[PDB]
From Swiss-Prot, chains A, C:
It is found in: Cell membrane. A motif (WSXWS motif) lies at residues 196-200. The chain holds residues 33 to 247 of 508 of the full protein. It comes from Homo sapiens (Human). This is Erythropoietin receptor. Residues 1-210 are extracellular. Erythroid cells and erythroid progenitor cells. Belongs to the type I cytokine receptor family. Type 1 subfamily. Residues 110-210 form the Fibronectin type-III domain. On EPO stimulation, phosphorylated on C-terminal tyrosine residues by JAK2. The phosphotyrosine motifs are also recruitment sites for several SH2-containing proteins and adapter proteins which mediate cell proliferation.
Length: 210, 222, 210, 222
């Protein structure tokens, strides 16, 4: 579903790699993809706790590519600490060995609840939205607003929004023009790392004449 | 005591250069091993902490230590692409031709992951360019499969067998055509790739390019 | 001077090519660069007028590269019409043969006269500027505003400005932050083609606390 | 009358497909020439107007017409990179191996300007891959000099002499090293470039890479 989109975006960033990320800071999913054929063992160690195993799930994708993934339980998903990962074949041969931090791979859902409204003066638009649903640390989420226009204009404005602010005021707009607004989300630094969310569902307005 | 070794393994994995020095100043085993038989030099090389790698080496770390999967610190530095750590390990006497339980050498992992500079320095320190892993794959097989153009040229120029066959009879031309790397196919063909070679299934790189549906590679291979 | 900057930007776009452009629509300069040695003849024809010659000028540049250029007189610089160009060696051998339109290669100077002022309400800034000096068709010049912030923030906003408007209102700014503003210029479509001007000289403001 | 030919030359240069048809419907010379002896097919091919090129050809244009500089319409379509116009000219019988007063063929200009697809179709229609211009330069000289990697591979695979020398004794390896194209140097070396060859000055590609100040090319050439 929505998970497949994020997994596809990361796979193009690092082929043949063991990619981990978190959508809402309350879980963690690591996955990789390879050719066709429990032949793999996923083991992990977290901050002076005993080495545990994670149940690997296997599903096919694309042109005969098999995707293995592990979703760590919510009990072992604490952030700001090193988490060591090892994927080993049934023969004991290596496959992957990484050391990650949970807070450094955040891939948020897109913000939701967009509301665009014309201001009482021509040319200005007040845009509001909601944080990615069911996501904590909304005070630490920063956004970016995209303003597009029709007739091949493309993106005419890109405005970054501060941490925790879900409001945006846009100006310098052409009258009698259909503008379209979208916003994406990201976890601010230095506490969290990651990339932008997907663009939200858009909302459009036809500006008046001026 | 073993606790100082366990704390040292944690400190190295966490990239804490000051805690690493304090623990060894108190007699921590620099070659301490976890349940995977991974030394602090393994973890320091894995996370890319050149400082801790140099400190551990300066205090007598086993530069060729192997964990229960057969991987050495140079394997980890080569897969992750840590150029400076690969250099210091090598000049400390790290075995450039060590292989894990996959039969893969640090050249295999660097060529697979596309680390061009590390591929060069590994060859520069005597890496076997035609090393075969447990699947008969050579560094050129992996580089051609993953579309690393410069590494293919580097391997070929340093004596890589262009017509090497793996356990399935596939040449680098097979893998490059299977993944649609056009210029790598052009380079392999130029370097003398046997275009008529067929794997254990009886398919040439052309037959793969047709099954893939790539017209361009199909026109090249003929 | 300012001409060298524009010539360097175009040379990286098309090496070994005969590059023409106009800074203010009142002249036209074509140039190319080659290795070391009147050995070239620049001739041009403009809209059913007799084939004339243009005085080529020669100057060295970079690592022994010689740059030849011709600046067409202001009498033969009318826009919206085909202008045929031929560079021929002394032997009669070819060198270049192109057909260009004068209005389709506009490289404006940067806008000037920036003035950034804090609004009477916290978070808003009114930015004003002037068109590229001594440039006609200022009604047809569109702009883009860049808002940068200190401490590694980089560019936080990019706002496109309509044709002929030399005013910009910016909002969504963080308080107690040094913001820096610049604007570039471009000739709007469909009448004119070309690329963005260089960024103007910047002006900076320290926003108040809110 | 000659006026219809002059108006036709203007109409073709201006890309006015309707005015071109009206003028020829009134008996305009389709092979009319300006003072440069350039036909409307020259100007239509120069501006990339495939429609007018096809109309002029359908009404009997001299597909191999040459102007006083020796350039033909296919020269112009190949330099500017007009793929479809190059194809229609070729299948109408345009001479793929015609040369201007520079001795350059359409393959020279396409290889110089980096038009990979046009380089291929020109070779596909029988272009001499080892053609030399008035300076002894070959298409590989120009492609290697201007850093066009794919064209170098295409030319080499189709039988380009890697050790070709121009009027100054320079090989493609000289020009590629002079312009700092590393992977092209790797390809030329792989294809059998004589690394010890020296121009009329006595300098090898290495001696050029040192005078250039490029350490990387200097380490490669040895
Ligand atoms: Mg981005
Ligand atoms: Mg032990
Ligand atoms: Mg731009
Ligand atoms: Mg005549």
């Amino acid at each position: 579903p929505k998970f497949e989109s994020k997994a596809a975006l990361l796979a193009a960033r690092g082929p043949e790699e063991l990619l981990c990320f978190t959508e809402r800071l309350e879980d963690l999913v690591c996955f990789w993809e390879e050719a066709a054929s429990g032949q793999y063992s996923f083991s992990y160690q977290l901050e002076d706790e005993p080495w545990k195993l994670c149940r690997l799930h296997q599903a096919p994708t694309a042109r005969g590519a098999v995707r293995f993934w592990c979703s760590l339980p919510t009990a072992d998903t604490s952030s700001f600490v090193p988490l060591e990962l090892r994927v080993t074949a049934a023969s004991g041969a290596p496959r992957y060995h990484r050391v990650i931090h949970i807070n450094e791979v955040v891939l948020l859902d897109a913000p939701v609840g967009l509301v665009a409204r014309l201001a009482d003066e021509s040319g200005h638009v007040v845009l509001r939205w909601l944080p990615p649903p069911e996501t904590p640390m909304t005070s630490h989420i920063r956004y970016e607003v995209d303003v597009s226009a029709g007739q091949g204009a493309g993106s005419v404005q890109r405005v970054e929004i501060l941490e925790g602010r879900t409001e945006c005021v846009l100006s310098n707009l052409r009258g009698r023009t259909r503008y379209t607004f979208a916003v994406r989300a990201r976890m601010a630094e230095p506490s969290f790392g990651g990339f932008w969310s997907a663009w939200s569902e858009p909302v459009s307005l036809l500006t008046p004449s001026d | 005591h073993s606790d100082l070794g366990k704390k040292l393994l944690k400190a190295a994995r966490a990239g804490q250069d000051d805690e690493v020095r304090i623990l060894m100043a108190n007699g921590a085993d620099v070659n301490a091993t976890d349940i995977w038989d991974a030394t602090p030099l393994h973890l320091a090389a894995l996370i890319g902490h050149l400082e801790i790698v140099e400190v551990l080496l300066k205090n007598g770390a086993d530069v060729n230590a192997s964990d229960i999967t057969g991987t050495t610190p140079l394997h980890l530095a080569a897969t992750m692409g840590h150029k400076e750590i690969v250099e210091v390990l090598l000049k400390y006497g790290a075995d450039v031709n060590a292989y894990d339980l996959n039969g893969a050498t640090p050249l295999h992992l660097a060529a697979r992951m596309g680390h061009a500079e590390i591929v060069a320095v590994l060859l520069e320190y005597g890496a076997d360019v035609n090393a075969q892993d447990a699947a008969g794959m050579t560094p050129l097989h992996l580089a051609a499969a993953n579309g690393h153009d410069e590494i293919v040229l580097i391997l070929l120029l340093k004596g890589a067998d262009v017509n090497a066959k793996d356990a399935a009879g596939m040449t680098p031309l097979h893998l490059a055509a299977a993944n649609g790397h056009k210029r790598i196919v052009l380079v392999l063909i130029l370097a003398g790739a046997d275009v008529n070679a067929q794997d254990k299934f009886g398919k040439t790189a052309f037959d793969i390019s047709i099954d893939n549906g790539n017209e361009d590679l199909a026109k090249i291979l003929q």
